[PDB]
Symmetry: D2
Subunit: 153 residues, 4 copies
């Protein structure tokens, strides 16, 4: 089923954010794309936009998220600090596919200063169209992540 | 100053783990390397080994960690669930460098089914020898990650 | 139509060559896979094996080639020295796809010390199943490569 | 010794070409940077610009070249068709380093639709500052490439 996508970014992606939104829409796999990054040419702090996208997902306003910074890495760290969210840094087709098949990730994290736009297109299209694999071992690992999060409190 | 490194992995890296430990030692940037992945040829669950390395760092038994799974992504997610830890998935020199310069990451997460061994060598050597940049904006972002983690509780 | 694949490599891929051949066979897109790299654990020179694969293609013993060295780069250079051959270094899905769509490459060049095995699987499967795009501009560029080669003599 | 660099590209890099030239200059490793790609916003054919850069090197107007297309791959193929030129497609630090250490490449080939700009910065700086390794085995392989080229005629 197509997905409701929340897209957040910092200023690193401000120049390209509409191009990225266009990819999401053109993928066929989104029923809605919501932009929650900066709407001005200002420097901003990626954790703040990570939090916007995480909270959209947690409140059921979006099903899936994409977070864009210079490398993806800050986005990945900040998003994973939210209880109930699994955020995957992906930089190619295989990481995009396995972040869904194995890690059943809610959020795709990408870098616009590291990945070119055609690679970002493939990553997005793969992430949005890949389902978590039915073999029980990957789900069991995901459940262990949940146990860690709960224990951390 | 050379660092005390905790290396954890799942079974994806079992075949290569001693080669990876050898890289860490040969880098010149480690005063000690401790292996905390599997010591048998069994299937295991990466979150369990992520937790070992996180807890080594948090207890001051290691200064820095390296976590290895098939892609790095599961390691990144699981490690970031620990309070006080920032875990960076890196797949090249620039991500290794910026994970330290900008995100001041405690843990390097890599994939042995995605990155070849010479790329892993460069990633490791860069991660272990790069310091966090003194411009205040990156530290401020890191502090925001801490605030998120604290709020999540 | 499935393809007849000649696989060549230097000693960098000797440990993994049968795993790579297995991927080619499992792709569904090969009617035959022929190994023309080293069948011993000796150091060898990649141009010699590049030439084997190039000559297989030129004589019609294979339709397509895969060349494996530490990075792919030496293979790419050496193969491209053959008249009538276009050899593409690929390291992800998008380069594999466009090396066929745009550059209509005969030979895939990969690095086993740079690309992990699951990325190599995706590269191979994509390269073998992607056809050259019908828009005339890419073919025209390919024809210009032919003119350069002919002029060089 | 700093190098005289010829930079060529097709229209894929037209938007970013001055940013790339700026990187080359800022690297410290160039005594001159000459742009030989398109100076208009028109569609063009990458082999034509590959040839410009190859001929600059062969005539001694430049010491080294950088060629930029959407992926690098077309540039790599076309440049390698010139007698006396070795052209390396690079997408990270390790490929940049080994393209010089091992393959003693004259031309760096990069993709602006595949590699982000910070990765391109690292690639360029590494390529321009890395010398060919003195162990005889890599030079001997390079000499074999020369023999192939001569035989092809």
């Amino acid at each position: 089923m197509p997905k409701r996508v929340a897209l957040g970014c910092d200023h690193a992606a401000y120049a390209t954010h509409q191009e990225i939104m266009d990819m999401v829409n053109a993928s066929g796999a989104a029923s809605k794309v919501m932009y929650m990054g900066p709407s001005s040419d200002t420097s901003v702090d990626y954790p703040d936009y990570a939090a916007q996208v995480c909270e959209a997902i947690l409140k059921g306003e979006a099903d899936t998220g994409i977070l864009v910074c210079g490398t993806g890495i800050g986005m990945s760290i900040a998003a994973n600090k939210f209880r109930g969210i699994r955020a995957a840094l992906c930089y190619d087709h295989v990481t995009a596919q396995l972040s869904r098949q194995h890690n059943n990730a809610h959020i795709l994290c990408i870098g616009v200063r590291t990945s070119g736009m055609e690679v970002i297109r493939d990553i997005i299209e793969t992430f949005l169209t890949t389902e978590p694999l039915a073999e029980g071992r990957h789900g069991n690992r995901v459940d262990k992540i949940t146990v860690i999060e709960e224990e951390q409190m």
